[PDB]
From TrEMBL, chain A:
<keyword id="KW-0602">Photosynthesis</keyword>
<keyword id="KW-0472">Membrane</keyword>
<keyword id="KW-0793">Thylakoid</keyword>
<keyword id="KW-1133">Transmembrane helix</keyword>
<feature type="binding site">
    <location>
        <position position="36"/>
    </location>
    <ligand>
        <name>chlorophyll a 1</name>
    </ligand>
</feature>
Automatic annotation (TrEMBL), chain B:
<feature type="binding site">
    <location>
        <position position="20"/>
    </location>
    <ligand>
        <name>[4Fe-4S] cluster 2</name>
    </ligand>
</feature>
<feature type="binding site">
    <location>
        <position position="47"/>
    </location>
    <ligand>
        <name>[4Fe-4S] cluster 2</name>
    </ligand>
</feature>
<protein>
    <recommendedName>
        <fullName>Photosystem I iron-sulfur center</fullName>
        <ecNumber>1.97.1.12</ecNumber>
    </recommendedName>
</protein>
<keyword id="KW-0004">4Fe-4S</keyword>
<dbReference type="GO" id="GO:0016491">
    <property type="term" value="F:oxidoreductase activity"/>
</dbReference>
TrEMBL record, chain C:
<keyword id="KW-0934">Plastid</keyword>
<comment type="function">
    <text>Participates in efficiency of electron transfer from plastocyanin to P700 (or cytochrome c553 in algae and cyanobacteria). This plastocyanin-docking protein contributes to the specific association of plastocyanin to PSI.</text>
</comment>
<comment type="similarity">
    <text>Belongs to the PsaF family.</text>
</comment>
<feature type="disulfide bond">
    <location>
        <begin position="7"/>
        <end position="62"/>
    </location>
</feature>
<dbReference type="Pfam" id="PF02507">
    <property type="entry name" value="PSI_PsaF"/>
</dbReference>
Automatic annotation (TrEMBL), chain G:
<comment type="similarity">
    <text>Belongs to the PsaJ family.</text>
</comment>
<dbReference type="GO" id="GO:0042651">
    <property type="term" value="C:thylakoid membrane"/>
</dbReference>
<keyword id="KW-0602">Photosynthesis</keyword>
<keyword id="KW-1133">Transmembrane helix</keyword>
<keyword id="KW-0812">Transmembrane</keyword>
């Protein structure tokens, strides 16, 4: 009753299940930046990087080698920036290797689309890491986790 | 792809053709054996290399041999 | 004497004997006299003493560690250490091999050799077992009559 | 609301309310055991919530009856919620 | 030729079906006529119900198609199964009963491919075919 | 209708087929053209499903094989009882259980092996035993070698009865398939009769024999002075002295005035202070309650009189929107396939063995078993191993059912079909969780090792550093500690003192004390989870992909146990459900080895020990576990290197046998790698050369020598691997614990 | 005795077990009556 063939195609390697094809799942996925409609590949990358650097700052800040030091937050931000640069390099090499120069009009599956996406991701990631750094440095709650 | 070859020791038993999970081997006409038929490998690009043909062969060393060569999607049996 | 000292006059050997006997006596001190444990430990002590005395009188050579060493070079003064035991082995092993080969041929010339090999014909097997006592002359007779070694052209071989 | 590709699901919150009441009202059954105090499961849970809200930032200590009461009450509540959804959607 | 309007054996769906490689490279199909509605085993996993009449099925591998065909031939007594290969261009090809008759029985018209005029013992040595274009046959 | 129907004289008892090996199989009856026939004979000896297509014949064979197994087990028990009666120091152990080491085996003085007859105690020297039979007998109330002789006689008589029953029910009166396919009747009778009446009879025995005898023994009365069980049975006054409620009679029972029996039927909990084991008065009530429960449970199913259930109806009624047809067809599957039943029963039996190991150490049930540390360790590890093997066998027979007895026509859109149809999701998710657990459980140990080796000891995952506290387990322990009087009001003590409480000490030695969980315990528990999950991954992946996969669409045709499908498709080695069982057995060995090592170290470091006059307990290793068990170096040094001293310095002692077995098990484990790392072609070519050597002397076997099949080589490698590893651990554990306990 | 039972006794594993048990007994009794013989006495 609840589990059915995917797209009414019994022979595709997929099943239509509540987790996979429910109304909430479809709405959530279609509203995420990777799928939302209208966003340029640059804006998708901007939102995703903003979201990702923000949470990247935390683990380094609270569990890095210099976590019991005065410079724990700055060290965490600088490690976040390093990891962001590494991942931006990963994105760039993936884009140059996977997508050939044919122009499909910035669909995020093109050379230009992926270049814009990785540029936006780098910018947004660095910005989000900086924003998290500012908030942690200025708010005691975030420095103590509520202690 | 893999190179499948047949030799004159073939007796036309056809078990090599019947054992192939793909359709790589077929029986053709011949005069060198009592059965009057010999195995042939026209669709060698579909061969996977399982050597089931080799297993289903009754002649002292095989009349059919599979030499594993370059690998492709079909040879590797990759459904993805 | 070759490079070592006789074991009958070695302080190390005597010390090892004393240590073994003292261990056994310490184990015995905690058991009532005449009880099975006491009798067993006393018999162990007697066996240890007899073994050490016999090793001493055997002419065995003992090193600094206090343990007998074997001179397996061919010296006739130490034949009993490796050569005569080795001769006894070779005798028994050739017996076994000769009778096994004879039974293999016997089963080869049967109606069902495989059946004769999994379910044996123990009368014939015992016959061959008995035959095995003159295997050296029998084996040499087979060799000279040419029934032992097969020709190079009659043995299967892989291609080069 | 579609629970799957094309299957609709009501998702009635009155089922949730009914299951909550069905588990909680029996939970009022008092017991004089130290864990409950003298009260029932639901009342003990409310009392613990208030007591540990009065001391807000310090979690109920390990060994406090709060954790056991919470676990038992929520196990029963979830069981009743599953059963009530089953009844409303299959036997409804 | 292949008719893409043949119904399918009312399968309930599985995760063993074809994937993006089927849409990108190659997608095989098998068509067969059934005298009644039986239950058969999908080569990908699970049970399916074949229809009374013509049934068309899509798979990712020729081996899967031929395994299904062998199941039909042996388990059931269906031997009119035809196998095709479809490219994204839509260029359906015909493969299994290539000459309308199964390869296990000789048929006039076939040309021997890959046949050698000696036993395996007559193959040349790699030393003899080294730095040359000769073949070990 | 549930009724009895048998065939009379179906098979004639004759030795004709004893001389025809392979008679059961058509391919083997022909004869041994090669040595592979010899191995096939044994590999297919008990595969009754491949000998014939007759379910009736298979069921009859299984019934008679079960009778033979029961006869063998009864012979085993009679042997143990007879050895206890004749070659044991049981009387001395009864006189002073805390001073003399139990022993029931004696070796002959042939080549100096008499050293193995160590000074166990009580004027007796033999081989110390770690099976707990002495404690079993003490709990049962045995106080003489005469009673043990009678026990051995009863065991021998039952073995004879069982063998006769097997022969009779194969050759004289063989029940039919209709008789066999009575699931309702077979469960009613098992539950009520077998289990319920067994625990009822054991409760009666405990109430009339074990309880007073053990009461006097704990009071200190001599075993010779204690009266006899029939004296207790017939002298209600004598029993009314020890348990004053027997003067009341059975009127309280039949009037439901059950409180009158509180003296000998009590919910007390804890451990007997004198013996260190569970209260036998608690065990009697436990078994009586179990008898009531089982006899009630055995009245659930319909046999002949309308009242009852039908499992077919229950299963077919249980279905939901996520499962389509639900449990439809499972009743037919389980009453038509022995392999499905074997898989279920093996899985449950193995899990039961594991549960039994856990519960039998935290709540020592027998008198003077808790302070017999060798017995506790040996029993725990033994039952853990049996459980692991049973689970792997359950996987194997699930695969065998899937390949052989699975029919898609009868399984359409039911639970089995739906599992097969989404097997990819299950295996992918289990793969991800296995990788995640492996990382976050073993990379923690690697991190700790690296930090300790770099001197950053403050960056480790330790109680003195970043902490991983099992707060949930500690919370459960607190609950169980406080339950007596609060959530179990009528229980005087906690179920186990491991959860918390006071130390139980017998003979100035800890019987059971609280077990504290910290960071090391958190890590080792998550490693247990990792290993279990990986084992499940291997076994379940094999079972689900037994019939077909994207790689081999026709695998059921190849079978349940085939070597490969050739070097094609990139290589299809070990693709069958048999090879899945093979790898999963390797991983079960890994899992159980880690579990038993955890038990050994934790119990020697934080539970077991000697209690001083100060009331303080010094443990065997002394808290090594908390700060050493957090690094692989800590395990290598403080557990393996440290505790292997007892076994490697055992030469010249009564544990010299343990040292020799240590070395031999190492040898066998290494010898397995020859089969595991190698292939058949090399050995067949070597055999070709050896056969040339034999032919040069005009002789060679008519049964052509052949290298082991690929599957047989894998099986030999696995068997030797498991034997060597388990034997190494066996010698190590027994030597260490017998030296320090 | 039944000829089939005798053939079953003649089967390879039974004969191997009996023969090797006999050989083990021979060696064991030799070591029991003449123990600790590390050498041929000369
Ligand atoms: C690795 C080389 C080597 C080899 C192959 C041998 C071989 C031999 N040594 Mg040895 N030996 C060696 C090194 C070696 N030795 C070394 C390095 C030393 C010094 C440490 C010795 C010191 C040594 C001594 C002192 C003696 C031997 C003797 C012997 C012979 C004993 C059997 C015999 O005499 O049969 C003879 C019997 C027959 C030919 C037939 C017997 C027929 C019936 C069955 C009786 C044998 C040929 C003994 C001997 O007499 O050698 C000539 C001997 O007395 N060796
Ligand atoms: C108690 C001590 C002891 C024990 C337990 C063993 C055990 C063994 N020995 Mg023996 N051996 C011993 C003492 C011992 N040996 C001594 C003291 C010597 C020195 C003489 C030898 C010399 C010896 C040899 C030379 C050989 C063995 C072999 C063996 C193994 C196989 C035997 C066999 O299959 O027989 C059953 C018999 C047969 C299968 C028939 C064929 C093989 C025998 C040995 C032929 C005998 C006659 C032949 C003409 C001798 C020519 C020897 C020359 C080429 C050097 C077996 C593990 C064999 C081995 O390891 O093979 C790989 C082997 O060839 N042993
Ligand atoms: C825990 C609470 C609980 C329980 C035990 C049940 C039990 C039952 N309900 Mg349900 N029901 C519940 C809560 C519960 N209900 C709630 C909260 C609602 C409101 C949404 C409903 C609304 C409802 C309706 C409208 C109907 C039922 C009916 C049923 C029966 C259907 C079968 C079933 O559920 O098998 C479960 C039964 C077992 C014995 C399983 C035992 C498992 C143990 C605990 C482990 C059964 C007697 C039907 C009925 O009347 O049937 C006669 C029916 O028509 N229920
Ligand atoms: C089924 C389990 C079992 C096991 C593993 C053993 C094991 C043993 N028994 Mg046996 N035994 C058993 C059942 C068992 N017994 C039963 C059911 C009885 C009652 C009849 C006996 C009665 C018995 C006696 C009377 C003796 C043994 C002895 C022995 C030991 C030496 C046996 C031997 O070398 O025989 C080798 C025999 C061959 C023919 C080979 C050995 C530890 C002996 C012992 O421990 O002596 C110190 C001994 O004297 N057992
Ligand atoms: C071949 C495997 C094997 C071997 C060699 C042993 C060996 C041993 N077991 Mg056993 N055991 C095994 C498998 C095995 N077990 C399995 C698979 C289980 C799980 C069912 C058990 C459960 C078990 C228990 C619970 C106990 C032993 C004990 C023992 C030791 C004493 C032997 C004895 O006579 O106990 C006699 C056994 C008893 C007096 C206790 C019986 C109580 C159980 C609960 C009865 C269950 C019976 C029932 C019909 C089984 C089916 C249940 C199912 C339908 C759910 C000995 C080391 C005893 C021990 O450790 O003593 C110190 C012990 O108490 N074992
Ligand atoms: C199958 C088990 C079993 C058996 C064979 C017996 C047998 C007996 N019981 Mg019973 N008894 C049992 C279980 C059993 N009891 C249990 C489980 C309990 C606990 C409720 C009792 C409690 C009990 C009492 C209190 C008394 C007996 C007594 C008796 C005797 C007279 C009836 C007889 C020897 C009477 C007697 O004489 O005991 C010595 C007696 O007074 N039994
Ligand atoms: C209730 C228990 C039970 C039962 C009734 C069966 C029944 C069966 N199993 Mg088994 N199985 C079990 C438990 C059980 N299994 C367990 C626990 C496992 C996990 C290891 C397996 C794993 C398993 C597999 C993987 C397979 C079977 C197969 C079979 C079938 C044929 C077995 C055969 O011919 O053996 C005959 C007996 C032997 C071959 C002897 C094997 C013993 C080895 C060599 C080790 C013995 C060592 C011993 C303990 C001594 C060590 C000490 C040393 C010093 C000597 C049969 C239906 C086979 C099947 O169905 O194939 C189609 C099959 O492939 N089983
Ligand atoms: C301490 C005790 C040891 C000292 C005792 C000495 C007695 C040894 C007896 C050996 C014996 O009887 O050999 C019996 C064998 C029979 O062999 C058999 O001879 C057969 C033919 S026939 O018997 O020779 O006619 C032949 O076919 C067969 O293969 C072969 O095995 O006799 C011979 O074949 C040749 C004997 C050697 C003659 C020279 C010996 C000189 C001394
Ligand atoms: C037990 C835990 C159950 C998880 C909820 C699952 C739940 O209770 O579902 C139960 C749900 C109820 O199904 P129906 O009501 O259709 O079936 C009732 C049955 O009795 C008849 O078959 O069945 C499914 O949808 C199965 C889905 C398994 C879901 C797979 C994910 C879980 C895998 C296991 C990993 C769990 C880790 C959890 C932490
Ligand atoms: C799934 C689930 C279950 C239980 C409940 C629960 C809530 C936990 C839920 C999970 C929730 C989760 C995982 C939430 C995670 C939220 C995250 C990661 C939020 C991230 C927010 C990011 C933010 C603001 C970033 C702000 C960045 C800014 C301005 C950057 C500004 C800048 C940029 C981009 C470039 C130039 C410089 C400048 C101007 C500074
Ligand atoms: C060593 C080895 C061999 C050669 C080993 C063979 C042929 C075993 C033959 C051993 C004899 C016949 C057994 C009898 C002697 C033993 C000492 C007794 C113990 C065995 C019984 C208990 C069964 C293989 O054939 C092989 C095949 C496939 C993978 C790995 C291997 C492999 O590793
Ligand atoms: S099997 Fe070998 S012989 Fe028989 S047909 Fe195929 S090739 Fe010719």
């Amino acid at each position: 009753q609840f589990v059915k063939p995917y797209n009414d195609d019994p022979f595709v390697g997929n099943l239509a299940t509540p987790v996979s094809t429910s109304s909430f799942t479809r709405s959530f996925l279609s509203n995420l930046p990777a799928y939302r409609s209208g966003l340029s590949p640059l804006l998708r990358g901007l939102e995703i990087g903003m979201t990702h650097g923000y949470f990247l700052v935390g683990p380094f800040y609270k569990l890095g080698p210099l976590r019991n030091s005065d410079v724990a937050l700055i060290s965490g931000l600088f490690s976040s920036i390093g990891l962001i640069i590494i991942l931006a390099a990963c994105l760039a090499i993936y884009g140059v290797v996977s997508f050939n120069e044919d122009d499909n009009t910035d669909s995020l599956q093109t050379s230009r689309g992926w270049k814009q996406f990785t540029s936006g991701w780098l910018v947004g990631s660095i910005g989000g890491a900086s924003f998290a750094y500012i908030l942690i440095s200025n708010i005691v709650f975030l420095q103590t986790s509520g202690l | 792809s893999h190179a499948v070859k047949v030799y004159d020791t073939c007796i036309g038993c056809t078990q090599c053709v019947r054992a192939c999970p793909c359709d790589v081997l077929e029986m053709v006409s011949w005069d060198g054996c009592k059965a009057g038929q010999i195995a042939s490998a026209p669709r060698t690009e579909d061969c996977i290399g399982c050597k089931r043909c080799e297993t289903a062969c009754p002649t002292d060393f095989l009349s059919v041999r599979v030499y594993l060569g370059g690998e492709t999607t079909r040879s590797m049996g990759l459904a993805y | 004497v070759a490079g070592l000292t006789p074991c009958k006059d070695s302080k190390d050997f005597q010390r090892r004997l004393d240590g073994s006997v003292k261990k056994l006596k310490t184990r015995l001190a905690k058991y009532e006299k005449g009880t099975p444990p006491a009798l067993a430990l006393e018999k162990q002590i007697e066996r240890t003493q007899a073994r050490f005395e016999r090793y001493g009188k055997a002419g065995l050579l003992c090193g600094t560690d206090g343990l007998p060493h074997l001179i397996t070079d061919g010296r006739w003064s130490h034949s009993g250490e490796f050569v005569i035991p080795g001769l006894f082995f070779l005798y028994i092993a050739g017996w076994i091999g000769w009778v096994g080969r004879s039974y293999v041929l016997f089963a080869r010339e049967s109606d069902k050799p495989t059946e004769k090999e999994i379910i044996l014909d123990v009368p014939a097997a015992l016959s061959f077992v008995s035959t095995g006592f003159i295997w050296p002359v029998s084996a040499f007779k087979e060799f000279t009559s040419g029934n032992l070694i097969a020709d190079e052209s009659e043995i299967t071989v892989s291609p080069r | 609301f579609e629970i799957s590709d094309g299957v609709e699901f009501d998702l009635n919150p009155l089922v949730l309310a009914i299951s909550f009441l069905g588990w909680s009202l029996p939970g009022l059954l008092p017991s004089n055991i130290p864990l409950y105090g003298g009260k029932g499961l639901t009342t003990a849970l409310f009392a613990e919530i208030g007591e540990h809200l009065q001391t807000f930032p310090a979690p109920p200590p390990i060994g406090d009856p709060f954790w056991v009461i919470l676990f038992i009450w929520h196990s029963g509540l979830f069981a009743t919620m599953i059963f009530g959804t089953i009844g409303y959607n299959g036997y409804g | 030729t292949l008719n893409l309007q043949i119904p399918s054996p009312t399968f309930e769906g599985s995760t063993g079906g074809w994937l993006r490689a089927a849409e990108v490279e190659e997608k095989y199909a098998i068509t067969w006529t059934s005298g009644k509605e039986q239950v058969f085993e999908m080569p990908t996993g699970g049970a399916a119900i074949m229809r009374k009449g013509e049934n068309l099925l899509y798979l990712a591998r020729k081996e899967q198609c031929l395994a299904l065909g062998t199941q039909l031939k042996t388990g059931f007594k269906i031997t009119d199964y035809k196998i095709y290969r479809i490219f994204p261009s839509g260029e359906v090809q015909y493969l299994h009963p290539k000459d309308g008759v199964f390869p296990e029985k000789v048929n006039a018209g076939r040309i021997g491919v890959g046949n050698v005029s000696h036993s395996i013992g007559k193959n040349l040595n790699p030393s003899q075919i080294k730095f040359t274009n000769k073949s070990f046959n | 209708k549930v009724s009895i129907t048998v065939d009379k004289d179906p098979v004639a008892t004759s030795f004709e087929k004893w001389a025809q090996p392979g008679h059961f199989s058509r391919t083997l009856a022909k004869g041994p053209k090669t040595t592979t026939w010899i191995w096939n004979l044994h590999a297919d000896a008990h595969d009754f499903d491949s000998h014939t297509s007759s379910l009736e014949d298979i069921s009859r064979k299984i019934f008679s094989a079960h009778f033979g197994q029961l006869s063998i087990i009864f012979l085993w028990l009679s042997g143990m009882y007879f050895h206890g009666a004749r070659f044991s120091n049981y009387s001395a152990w009864l006189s002073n259980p805390t001073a003399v080491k139990p022993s029931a085996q004696v070796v002959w003085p042939i080549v100096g092996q008499e050293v193995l007859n160590g000074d166990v105690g009580g004027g007796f020297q033999g081989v110390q035993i770690t099976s707990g039979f002495f404690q079993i007998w003490r709990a049962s109330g045995i106080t003489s070698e005469v009673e043990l002789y009678w026990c051995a006689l009863a065991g021998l008589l039952m073995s004879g009865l069982m063998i006769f029953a097997g022969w009779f029910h194969y050759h004289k009166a063989a029940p039919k398939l209709e008789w066999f396919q009575n699931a309702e009747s077979m469960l009613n009778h098992h539950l009520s009769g077998l289990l319920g009446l067994g625990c009822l009879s054991w409760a009666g025995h405990q109430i009339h024999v074990s309880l007073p005898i053990n009461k006097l023994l704990d009071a200190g009365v001599a075993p010779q002075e204690i009266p006899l069980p029939h004296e207790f049975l017939v002298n209600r006054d004598l029993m009314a002295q020890l348990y004053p409620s027997f003067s009341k009679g059975l009127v309280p029972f039949f009037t439901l005035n059950w409180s009158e029996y509180s003296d000998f039927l009590t919910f007390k909990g804890g451990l007997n202070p004198v013996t260190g084991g569970l209260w036998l008065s608690d065990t009697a009530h436990h078994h009586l309650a179990l008898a009531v429960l089982f006899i009630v449970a055995g009245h659930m199913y319909r046999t002949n009189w309308g009242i009852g259930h039908s499992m077919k109806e229950i299963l077919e009624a249980h279905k939901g929107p996520f499962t389509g047809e639900g449990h439809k067809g499972l009743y037919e599957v389980l009453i038509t396939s022995w392999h499905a039943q074997l898989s279920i029963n093996l899985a449950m039996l193995g899990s039961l063995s594991i549960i039994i190991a856990h519960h039998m150490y935290a709540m020592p049930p027998y008198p003077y078993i808790a302070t017999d540390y060798p017995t506790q360790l040996s029993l725990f590890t033994h039952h853990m191993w049996i459980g692991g093997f049973c689970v792997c066998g359950a996987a194997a027979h699930a695969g065998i059912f899937m390949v052989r007895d699975y029919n898609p026509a009868q399984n359409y859109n039911n639970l089995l079909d739906r599992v097969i149809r989404h097997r990819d999701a299950i295996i992918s998710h289990l793969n991800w969780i296995c990788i995640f657990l492996g990382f976050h459980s073993f990379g923690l140990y690697i991190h700790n090792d690296t930090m300790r080796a770099l001197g950053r000891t403050q960056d480790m995952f330790s109680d003195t550093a970043i902490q991983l506290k099992p707060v949930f387990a500690q919370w459960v322990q607190n609950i169980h500690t406080v339950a007596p009087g609060n959530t179990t009001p009528n229980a005087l003590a906690t179920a186990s003192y491991a959860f918390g409480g006071n130390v139980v000490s017998v003979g100035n030695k800890v019987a059971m004390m609280p077990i504290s969980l910290g960071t090391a315990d958190f890590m080792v528990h998550h490693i247990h989870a990792f290993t279990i999950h990986v084992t499940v991954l291997i076994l379940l992946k094999g079972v689900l992909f037994s019939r077909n996969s994207r790689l081999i669409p026709d695998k059921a045709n190849l079978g349940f146990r085939f070597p490969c499908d050739g070097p094609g498709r990139g290589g299809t080695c070990q693709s069958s459900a048999w090879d899945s069982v093979f790898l999963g057995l390797f991983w079960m060995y890994n899992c159980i080895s880690v579990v038993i090592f955890h038990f050994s170290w934790k119990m020697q470091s934080d539970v077991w020990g000697t209690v001083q006059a100060d009331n303080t307990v010094t443990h065997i290793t002394g808290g090594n576990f908390a700060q050493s068990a957090i690094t692989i170096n800590g395990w290598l040094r403080d557990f393996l290197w440290a505790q292997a001293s007892q076994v490697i310095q055992s030469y010249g002692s009564s544990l010299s046998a343990y040292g020799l077995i240590f070395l031999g098990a190492h040898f066998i484990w290494a010898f397995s790698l020859m089969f595991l790392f190698s292939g058949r072609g090399y050995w067949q070519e070597l055999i070709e050369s050896v056969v040339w050597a034999h032919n040069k002397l005009n002789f060679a076997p008519a049964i052509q020598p052949r290298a082991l099949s690929i599957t047989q080589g894998r099986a030999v490698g696995l068997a030797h691997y498991l034997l060597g590893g388990i034997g190494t651990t066996w010698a190590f554990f027994l030597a260490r614990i017998i030296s320090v306990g | 005795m039944d000829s089939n039972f005798l053939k079953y006794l003649s089967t390879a594993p039974v004969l191997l077990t009996v023969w090797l048990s006999f050989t083990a007994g021979l060696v064991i009794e030799a070591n029991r009556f003449f123990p600790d013989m590390l050498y041929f006495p000369m």
